[PDB]
Amino acid sequence: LESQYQVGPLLGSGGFGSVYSGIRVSDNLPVAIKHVEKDRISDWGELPNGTRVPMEVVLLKKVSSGFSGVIRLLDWFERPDSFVLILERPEPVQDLFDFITERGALQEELARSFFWQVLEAVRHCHNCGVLHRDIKDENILIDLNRGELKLIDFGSGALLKDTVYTDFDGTRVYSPPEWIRYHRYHGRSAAVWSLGILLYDMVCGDIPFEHDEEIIRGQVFFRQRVSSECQHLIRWCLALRPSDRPTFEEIQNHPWMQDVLLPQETAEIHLH
Ligand SMILES: CN1CCN(c2ccc(-c3cc4c(Cl)cc(C(N)=O)nc4n3C)cc2)CC1
Numbered sequence: 001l002e003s004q005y006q007v008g009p010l011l012g013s014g015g016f017g018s019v020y021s022g023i024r025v026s027d028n029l030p031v032a033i034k035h036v037e038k039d040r041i042s043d044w045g046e047l048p049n050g051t052r053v054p055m056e057v058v059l060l061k062k063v064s065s066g067f068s069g070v071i072r073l074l075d076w077f078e079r080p081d082s083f084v085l086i087l088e089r090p091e092p093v094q095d096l097f098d099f100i101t102e103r104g105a106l107q108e109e110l111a112r113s114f115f116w117q118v119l120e121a122v123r124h125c126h127n128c129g130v131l132h133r134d135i136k137d138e139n140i141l142i143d144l145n146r147g148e149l150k151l152i153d154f155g156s157g158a159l160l161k162d163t164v165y166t167d168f169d170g171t172r173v174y175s176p177p178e179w180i181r182y183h184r185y186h187g188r189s190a191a192v193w194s195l196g197i198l199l200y201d202m203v204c205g206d207i208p209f210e211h212d213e214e215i216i217r218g219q220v221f222f223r224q225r226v227s228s229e230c231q232h233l234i235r236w237c238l239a240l241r242p243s244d245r246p247t248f249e250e251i252q253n254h255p256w257m258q259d260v261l262l263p264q265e266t267a268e269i270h271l272h
Contacts, residue, residue: 001077001084005033016153021089024074031074032089036155037082042169043158054083059154063128069121070151071141087152092144096137096202105205105224108256113266114142115199116257117149122191123248125151131160131187134170135194137201147267160187173197173207177216177240189242195251196237203230208238229256 008021017036024031036054045058053076060073075086096114100106106114118140125132132139134156141150156170164184168175176193179185200208204224209215218240222231233256239245251257261269 005031005086007033016155022086024086029074030089030091032071032087034085034087035082036085039081041083043156053078054155055157056153056155057083057085059130059157059159060085062130063125063154068124069117069149070124090141090143090146090148090150093141094144096140096142096149099142100137100201100205106202107270108203108227108230109261110266110270111199111202111230112257113147113261113263113270114140114149114202115195116252116260117263118151118195118198119248119252121149121151122195126160126188126191126248129160130154131158131191133157133168133190134174135191135198136171136174137198138171142271144271145267147263147265147271149263158187162186165190170194172212173209173215175215176242177218178242180212180215186242188247189245192237192245192248192251193242196234196245199230199237200234203234227256229254232256 004025006023006025008023011019011021011032013019017034020033022031022033023029041054043055044052045055046052047058057073057076063070064072072088073085074088077084122132122135132151132154134153139151139153141152143150158165164186166184168179174194174197176185176190179190197207200220203226204222208220218238220235220238233251233254236246
């Protein structure tokens with residue numbers, strides 16, 4: 001492990017563990033090296049072989065085949081008291097949260113391109129039987145050269161199911177009112193609610209709700225000029241009743257979602 005990869009600066013640490021910049025020595029491939037303490041691990045999973053690993057590894061393996069807008073797991077190691085994950089690292093890259101901190105509310109054309117790519121990435125996860133459960137700007141990376149977004153940190157996720165979820169460990173201000181009130185939600189509609197929060201976050205420069213009371217009321221106020229079509233999509237995603245929320249298909253067929261830029265166009269125009 002410590003011979004295969006050369007370790008660089010710490011990129012960040014928190015509920016996800018400690019993530020380091022790194023370079024695979026084999027071929028000089030840029031990587032991110034993520035350490036997770038076993039004590040601090042909340043949800044565990046099992047590999048097709050039967051060995052017990054963090055759910056994050058199970059989930060990443062189910063989605064890490066092929067190409068997509070999900071960061072790929074290259075390898076993992078177990079240590080006596082932690083697991084170490086080796087993840088692909090685009091360069092240069094900036095997470096969407098820092099990007100929004102820098103530039104404030106995003107132009108709708110740019111928000112459209114970004115949001116579209118998040119949708120495509122979430123659909124891929126769902127198709128692979130994976131529910132992320134912590135979709136937010138902190139968990140999205142921007143490949144600044146290619147204009148491609150990448151989903152990260154599946155450590156709060158779960159296998160997708162059609163029955164009710166009664167556990168949740170993701171970010172509360174992104175969590176749906178049915179979770180706040182009843183501690184029950186279903187996968188796809190919970191996800192759509194968090195996409196509503198995210199889209200609002202992009203076009204307004206901050207999240208719409210800070211308190212349980214606001215989430216439960218579900219009243220959306222716009223502090224920035226936002227087109228009526230975008231306001232409509234956001235409020236649809238943020239429907240109080242789960243079944244009143246759009247499916248992914250309905251989101252991507254919405255009028256506001258038409259004529260999206262290609263990623264490379266996006267980088268050229270907006271990320272120079
Ligand atoms: C000053 N620069 C800021 C942007 N930058 C950078 C590089 C990598 C990351 C990064 C990649 C990455 C990956 Cl692939 C996974 C995870 C994770 N949490 O699983 N985190 C990552 N970070 C922070 C963030 C910022 C390089 C230094």
